[PDB]
Design an enzyme around this catalytic site. Sequence first.
Site, PDB file in Angstrom:
ATOM      1  N   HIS A  79       0.962  -1.267  -0.110  1.00 43.92           N
ATOM      2  CA  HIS A  79       0.129  -0.098   0.115  1.00 43.92           C
ATOM      3  C   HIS A  79       0.782   1.178  -0.052  1.00 43.92           C
ATOM      4  O   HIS A  79       0.381   2.380  -0.582  1.00 43.92           O
ATOM      5  CB  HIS A  79      -0.902   0.059   1.041  1.00 43.92           C
ATOM      6  CG  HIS A  79      -1.940  -1.122   1.361  1.00 43.92           C
ATOM      7  ND1 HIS A  79      -1.806  -2.149   2.121  1.00 43.92           N
ATOM      8  CD2 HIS A  79      -3.208  -1.383   0.857  1.00 43.92           C
ATOM      9  CE1 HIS A  79      -2.795  -3.119   1.887  1.00 43.92           C
ATOM     10  NE2 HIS A  79      -3.767  -2.448   1.064  1.00 43.92           N
TER      11      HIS A  79
ATOM     12  N   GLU B  83      -1.110  -4.535  -8.957  1.00 43.81           N
ATOM     13  CA  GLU B  83      -1.339  -5.544  -9.947  1.00 43.81           C
ATOM     14  C   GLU B  83      -1.353  -6.753  -9.299  1.00 43.81           C
ATOM     15  O   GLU B  83      -1.759  -7.821 -10.079  1.00 43.81           O
ATOM     16  CB  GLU B  83      -0.053  -5.494 -11.032  1.00 43.81           C
ATOM     17  CG  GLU B  83      -0.213  -4.488 -12.033  1.00 43.81           C
ATOM     18  CD  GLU B  83       0.930  -4.494 -13.240  1.00 43.81           C
ATOM     19  OE1 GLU B  83       1.692  -5.502 -13.125  1.00 43.81           O
ATOM     20  OE2 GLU B  83       0.764  -3.888 -14.100  1.00 43.81           O
TER      21      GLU B  83
ATOM     22  N   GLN C  50      -9.311  -7.925  -9.538  1.00 44.45           N
ATOM     23  CA  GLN C  50      -9.603  -6.362  -9.255  1.00 44.45           C
ATOM     24  C   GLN C  50      -9.363  -5.365  -9.864  1.00 44.45           C
ATOM     25  O   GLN C  50     -10.244  -4.361 -10.723  1.00 44.45           O
ATOM     26  CB  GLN C  50      -9.460  -6.150  -7.749  1.00 44.45           C
ATOM     27  CG  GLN C  50     -10.196  -6.222  -6.689  1.00 44.45           C
ATOM     28  CD  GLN C  50     -10.247  -5.629  -5.424  1.00 44.45           C
ATOM     29  OE1 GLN C  50      -9.655  -4.197  -5.274  1.00 44.45           O
ATOM     30  NE2 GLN C  50     -10.698  -6.162  -4.320  1.00 44.45           N
TER      31      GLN C  50
END
Lengths: 282, 282
Positions: free
Chosen positions: A37, A150, A155
């Site tokens: 993140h 990725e 998603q």
Amino acid sequence: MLIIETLPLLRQQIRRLRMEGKRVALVPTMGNLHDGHMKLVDEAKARADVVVVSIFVNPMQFDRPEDLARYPRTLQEDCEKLNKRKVDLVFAPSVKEIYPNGTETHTYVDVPGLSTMLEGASRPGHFRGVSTIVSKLFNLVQPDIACFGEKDFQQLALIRKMVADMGFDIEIVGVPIMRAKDGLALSSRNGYLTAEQRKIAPGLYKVLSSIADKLQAGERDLDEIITIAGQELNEKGFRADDIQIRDADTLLEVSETSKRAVILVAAWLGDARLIDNKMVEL
Amino acid sequence: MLIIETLPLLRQQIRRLRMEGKRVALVPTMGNLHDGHMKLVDEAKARADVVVVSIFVNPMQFDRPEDLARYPRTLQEDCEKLNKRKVDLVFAPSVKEIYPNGTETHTYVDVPGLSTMLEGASRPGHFRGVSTIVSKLFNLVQPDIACFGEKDFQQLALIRKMVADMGFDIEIVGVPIMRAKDGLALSSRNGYLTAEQRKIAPGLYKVLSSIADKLQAGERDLDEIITIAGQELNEKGFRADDIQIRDADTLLEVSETSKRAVILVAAWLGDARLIDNKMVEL
């Protein structure tokens, strides 16, 4: 770093940022933040004037309420990490703020096909949950750009298709997997490898890259490509576990129309089940 | 007046209006415009700097191919009307521009409850077609305001719920139906009115107005309100009234939580069958 919890106050901050002509990037998350993140945030900071990170454990994308209850929540730590990364705004709403009447009668967004294949086949409703909250966040934050990893290739494909279809004027940035200098995908899982296993481990990426090379060179005998890939992994010291090649945009079998492919590999090494993926232009 | 047919060119215009600091009202339509559509446009013009009208016969909200093919397409005459109304921009895309891959695998937006009740119950997929194309138009045009006619009360409730749930920063304006200065609801059926019946016909809106006034004052004995309205109509010369009162937001019975009501009435004047409607804030 502002931490915003309600829709009215978010809309005020967003209207004012845009009034000032700031380009906004959005990183949607469910909290429990890790280095993956932090790379999304770094990409967002380089590409936009202002970075917004959402932290919301979204009930709509969980299979049952007990799973939702067990999901890790680390808001304080998350906020310490983003504040150190110079994030401008964190949106951390409650479930009641987002779903005041619950989720079952809330408007939803569904991406046909992508939502019900692979992972979505075993998790009905999950991807519907993803496309619904991401659409809502796009309308609330009105970002110019939004960053996704990725690694969660399904998603990413889902959101790319949703954006194209629904007419959002948002650039979707797919951020590649971070790797060690030897090519191994960085992961908590590497922690379970002995030092000798850690030396063998970059072989997984080598095989993955070999598959891509073949695909990029027109090979279309996938079954053989995959058979050889497994043999190679096994001769290296791995125990091949799963290898798959798909259309990157539609997640279907590669066909004469496919223009990009995604390759997914899993292989055991010691007590680690290492995982990697790569997209290749066709 | 500009006439735009593709997404890239529309996006260019929306960027220009943003740079100019203009507030934008959108009037979504399926063309084959008449005076009641012109009233939507006039309401948009009074509330915003710039008016965008979309003209698009959306296949996703059509039951059968037959009905789609046979829907009247009259772009040139539509455009001559909007030009006289001083509309700034007309968006008239082709089906392939909106649905390059068809509608079946296109991302969709569904509003639970509202989409499946009443007219929705016999027309599976219809209101999903509407919520889908209106969300896309909102993402493409990014208007401040969008205008919709009160006669399609189900659509209005549908879009207000979609907007609240999905987080669009857009004011939804319901425009009361068009009416003569004496209060008669305009209608092609009015032509069958003789001179004398045309004289009695404004009584219907008087009774509707009285119902509305009662609901405004707090009255909640609907059966009684409706029985009295029927007697008033009988006295004025109408017959066989059919009157319904609903929560205009949920389309269910009026409740302690109701904030708006829709009153629908049909009554016969000789062999002519007049209809009318009124929305009221509670």
